[PDB]
Coordinates of C-alpha atoms (C1' of nucleotides) in Angstrom, one line a residue:
Chain A
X1 CA -34.9 8.0 55.6
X2 CA -33.1 5.8 53.0
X3 CA -30.7 8.8 52.6
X4 CA -27.1 9.4 53.4
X5 CA -26.1 5.8 52.8
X6 CA -22.5 6.5 53.9
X7 CA -24.0 7.0 57.4
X8 CA -26.1 3.8 57.0
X9 CA -23.1 1.8 56.0
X10 CA -21.2 3.3 59.0
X11 CA -24.0 2.4 61.4
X12 CA -24.1 -1.2 59.9
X13 CA -20.6 -1.7 61.3
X14 CA -19.5 -4.4 58.8
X15 CA -17.1 -2.1 56.9
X16 CA -19.6 -1.8 54.0
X17 CA -19.6 1.3 51.8
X18 CA -22.6 3.5 50.7
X19 CA -22.7 2.0 47.2
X20 CA -22.9 -1.6 48.3
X21 CA -25.5 -0.9 51.0
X22 CA -27.6 1.0 48.5
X23 CA -27.3 -1.7 45.8
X24 CA -28.4 -4.4 48.3
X25 CA -31.3 -2.3 49.6
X26 CA -32.5 -1.4 46.1
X27 CA -32.3 -5.0 45.0
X28 CA -34.5 -5.8 48.1
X29 CA -36.5 -2.5 48.3
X30 CA -40.2 -3.0 48.0
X31 CA -40.6 0.7 47.2
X32 CA -38.3 0.4 44.2
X33 CA -39.4 -3.0 42.7
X34 CA -43.0 -1.8 42.0
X35 CA -45.3 -4.8 42.5
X36 CA -47.8 -2.0 42.9
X37 CA -49.6 0.3 40.5
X38 CA -50.2 4.0 40.5
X39 CA -52.5 6.3 38.4
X40 CA -49.8 8.4 36.9
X41 CA -47.7 5.4 35.8
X42 CA -50.8 3.9 34.1
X43 CA -51.7 7.1 32.4
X44 CA -48.2 7.8 31.1
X45 CA -47.7 4.2 30.1
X46 CA -50.9 4.4 28.0
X47 CA -49.8 7.7 26.5
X48 CA -46.3 6.5 25.5
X49 CA -47.7 3.2 24.2
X50 CA -50.3 4.9 22.1
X51 CA -47.7 7.4 20.8
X52 CA -45.2 4.8 19.7
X53 CA -47.0 1.4 19.3
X54 CA -47.5 0.2 15.7
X55 CA -49.7 -2.9 15.4
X56 CA -48.8 -5.5 17.9
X57 CA -45.3 -4.1 18.8
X58 CA -44.9 -1.8 21.8
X59 CA -41.7 -0.6 23.6
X60 CA -42.4 -2.8 26.6
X61 CA -39.4 -1.8 28.7
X62 CA -38.1 1.4 27.0
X63 CA -40.9 3.2 28.7
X64 CA -39.1 2.4 32.0
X65 CA -36.8 5.4 31.4
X66 CA -39.8 7.7 31.9
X67 CA -41.6 5.8 34.7
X68 CA -39.7 5.1 37.9
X69 CA -39.1 1.9 39.8
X70 CA -39.4 -0.5 36.9
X71 CA -37.2 -2.5 34.5
Chain B
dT1 C1' -59.5 -8.2 35.3
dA2 C1' -55.1 -5.2 31.8
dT3 C1' -51.0 -4.7 32.9
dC4 C1' -46.5 -5.2 35.0
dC5 C1' -41.8 -6.4 38.2
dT6 C1' -37.8 -9.1 37.5
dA7 C1' -37.0 -13.2 42.4
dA8 C1' -35.4 -17.6 39.0
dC9 C1' -35.3 -19.0 34.5
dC10 C1' -35.7 -19.1 28.7
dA11 C1' -34.6 -16.4 23.9
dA12 C1' -31.7 -13.0 22.0
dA13 C1' -28.4 -8.7 21.7
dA14 C1' -24.1 -7.4 23.5
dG15 C1' -20.4 -8.0 26.5
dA16 C1' -17.0 -10.9 28.1
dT17 C1' -13.2 -15.1 28.9
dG18 C1' -9.9 -18.8 27.5
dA19 C1' -8.2 -22.2 23.7
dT20 C1' -7.0 -22.6 19.2
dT21 C1' -5.6 -21.1 14.2
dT22 C1' -3.4 -18.0 11.1
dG23 C1' -0.7 -13.6 10.1
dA24 C1' 3.6 -12.2 11.3
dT25 C1' 8.6 -12.4 13.3
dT26 C1' 13.2 -14.3 13.4
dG27 C1' 17.4 -17.8 14.7
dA28 C1' 20.4 -20.2 12.4
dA29 C1' 22.4 -21.5 8.2
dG30 C1' 23.2 -21.9 2.5
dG31 C1' 26.1 -18.1 1.2
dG32 C1' 29.8 -15.3 0.0
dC33 C1' 32.5 -11.3 1.0
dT34 C1' 36.9 -8.2 3.7
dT35 C1' 42.2 -6.1 3.8
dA36 C1' 47.1 -8.2 5.1
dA37 C1' 51.1 -10.3 3.1
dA38 C1' 53.7 -13.0 -1.2
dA39 C1' 54.0 -14.7 -5.9
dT40 C1' 55.0 -15.9 -11.0
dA41 C1' 52.5 -15.5 -15.2
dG42 C1' 50.6 -12.8 -18.3
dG43 C1' 46.2 -10.2 -22.2
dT44 C1' 45.0 -5.0 -24.2
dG45 C1' 42.5 -0.1 -23.7
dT46 C1' 43.0 3.7 -22.6
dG47 C1' 44.4 7.5 -21.1
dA48 C1' 47.9 10.4 -20.8
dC49 C1' 50.9 12.8 -24.0
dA50 C1' 51.3 16.0 -27.7
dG51 C1' 49.8 18.6 -31.7
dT52 C1' 47.1 21.4 -34.6
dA53 C1' 41.5 22.5 -34.7
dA54 C1' 37.6 25.0 -34.7
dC55 C1' 34.3 27.9 -33.2
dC56 C1' 33.0 31.5 -31.0
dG57 C1' 29.1 70.1 -21.8
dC58 C1' 31.8 73.0 -25.2
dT59 C1' 35.1 74.5 -29.4
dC60 C1' 38.1 73.5 -33.8
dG61 C1' 39.2 70.3 -38.7
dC62 C1' 37.8 68.1 -42.8
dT63 C1' 34.7 67.3 -46.8
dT64 C1' 31.5 68.3 -51.0
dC65 C1' 28.6 70.4 -55.2
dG66 C1' 27.0 74.1 -57.1
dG67 C1' 27.0 80.0 -58.5
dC68 C1' 29.2 82.8 -60.6
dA69 C1' 34.1 83.6 -63.0
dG70 C1' 37.2 82.8 -67.4

DNA sequence: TATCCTAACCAAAAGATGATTTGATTGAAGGGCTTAAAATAGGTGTGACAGTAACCGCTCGCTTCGGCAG
C-alpha cells in the first residue's frame, strides 16, 4: 500500500533502506507528481492567488505548501 | 482551453567547493645583557655621625562683707 517502506526495502532484497526506496518511488510516483488536476486544488489555488496576488505577480510555487503533490 | 508538474534545461537566490590573496604568526638574527674572578687608577656626595632645635555618696576647713559695738 506504499506504506511501511522498511518492509518494502527488505522485500526488495538489494540492501536498500526505507528512505532510499521512498525517495526513488516518490521521484517516480505518478500519484505524487500531479500531472493531473482536482477540483479542491483548483479552488484553493484560486483562493490563495486572489488573496495574495497583486497585479501580475502571484506566489506561483509558495502555494505548494498548502496543496499536496506539487513543487 | 487556464493552469500546472518538474523529467531536462535556463535565470536567479542560496548553498557549496577548491585556488588564491591578505591578515596574522614566528624563526633567526641585530642586539646587548648576566655573576665569577683579578686589577690598578682614581672623582665627590652623601650619609652617617653628632649636636642642639622646635613644636607640640557623705562630712569637716577656709574665706568674706556687712550689723551692730566702741
